[PDB]
């Protein structure tokens, strides 16, 4: 997709294991493949669940980026301060403050 | 006060005794304080009585920086919301918003 042509079939290792060897026709060529991974919600199994995620991260390894949420109280403080600044600026510009 | 100001708050020996140390905030700062003095009417105690009255007089000159308390963690939020309400009311009443 990136370029548009490259030809060189490379060499996808199929003979390294019998599982991938027998599934050669299904995996490659004009075909489609899907991967469904199961997750356990229990805390006690935490590491194992993480391991599944590390195995579920495969087949692309896309970028999940940073994940974080500001505190809701701090969010309200920030929004209120911005609103106060905006309304004060409007009043001062219009001469009513 | 005698003059008006010039900084230099000096230092009152509060650590010299546990009594004054524990009562640091009550003698000065965030509190309203009342002194009650007891007098023995007999002549024999006269000097002692005078001393009490003298120190009692000095107790009148002390000024305290009393504050209520509230809770800034929530009173800041309340004050910002009230400011937003005031600015909104001013803008809508004057036809600016």
Curated annotation (Swiss-Prot), chains A, B:
Changing residue 13 to L: In SPG30A; affects subcellular location, binding to microtubules and motility; contrary to wild-type, does not accumulate in the distal tips of differentiated SH-SY5Y cells, but localizes closer to the cell body in transfected cells; retains its ability to move processively along microtubules, but shows reduced velocity; small decrease of interaction with microtubules. It comes from the Eukaryota. Changing residue 52 to M: In KAND; affects subcellular location; contrary to wild-type, does not accumulate in the distal tips of differentiated SH-SY5Y cells, but localizes closer to the cell body in transfected cells. Residues 74-91 form a coiled coil. Expressed in neurons. It is found in: Cytoplasm, Cytoskeleton; Cell projection, Neuron projection; Cell projection, Axon; Cytoplasm, Perinuclear region. Dimeric motor; dimerization is required for ATP-driven processive motility. Monomer in vitro. Interacts with PPFIA1 and PPFIA4. Interacts with CALM1; the interaction is increased in presence of calcium and increases neuronal dense core vesicles motility. Interacts with PPFIA2 and TANC2; both interactions allow the recruitment of neuronal dense core vesicles to dendritic spines and decrease in presence of calcium. Interacts with SYT4 (unphosphorylated) and SYT11; both interactions increase in presence of calcium. Interacts with MADD. It is linked to Spastic paraplegia 30A, autosomal dominant: A form of spastic paraplegia, a neurodegenerative disorder characterized by a slow, gradual, progressive weakness and spasticity of the lower limbs. Rate of progression and the severity of symptoms are quite variable. Initial symptoms may include difficulty with balance, weakness and stiffness in the legs, muscle spasms, and dragging the toes when walking. In some forms of the disorder, bladder symptoms (such as incontinence) may appear, or the weakness and stiffness may spread to other parts of the body. Spastic paraplegia 30B, autosomal recessive: A form of spastic paraplegia, a neurodegenerative disorder characterized by a slow, gradual, progressive weakness and spasticity of the lower limbs. Rate of progression and the severity of symptoms are quite variable. Initial symptoms may include difficulty with balance, weakness and stiffness in the legs, muscle spasms, and dragging the toes when walking. In some forms of the disorder, bladder symptoms (such as incontinence) may appear, or the weakness and stiffness may spread to other parts of the body. Kinesin motor with a plus-end-directed microtubule motor activity. It is required for anterograde axonal transport of synaptic vesicle precursors. Also required for neuronal dense core vesicles (DCVs) transport to the dendritic spines and axons. The interaction calcium-dependent with CALM1 increases vesicle motility and interaction with the scaffolding proteins PPFIA2 and TANC2 recruits DCVs to synaptic sites. Composed of an N-terminal active core containing the motor domain (MD) and a neck coil (NC), a central regulatory center containing the FHA domain and coiled coils (CC1 and CC2) and required for dimerization and activation, and a cargo-recognition region containing a coiled coil (CC3), an undefined region (UDR) and the C-terminal PH domain. Belongs to the TRAFAC class myosin-kinesin ATPase superfamily. Kinesin family. Unc-104 subfamily. This is Kinesin-like protein KIF1A. It comes from Homo sapiens. The chain holds residues 293 to 389 of 1690 of the full protein.
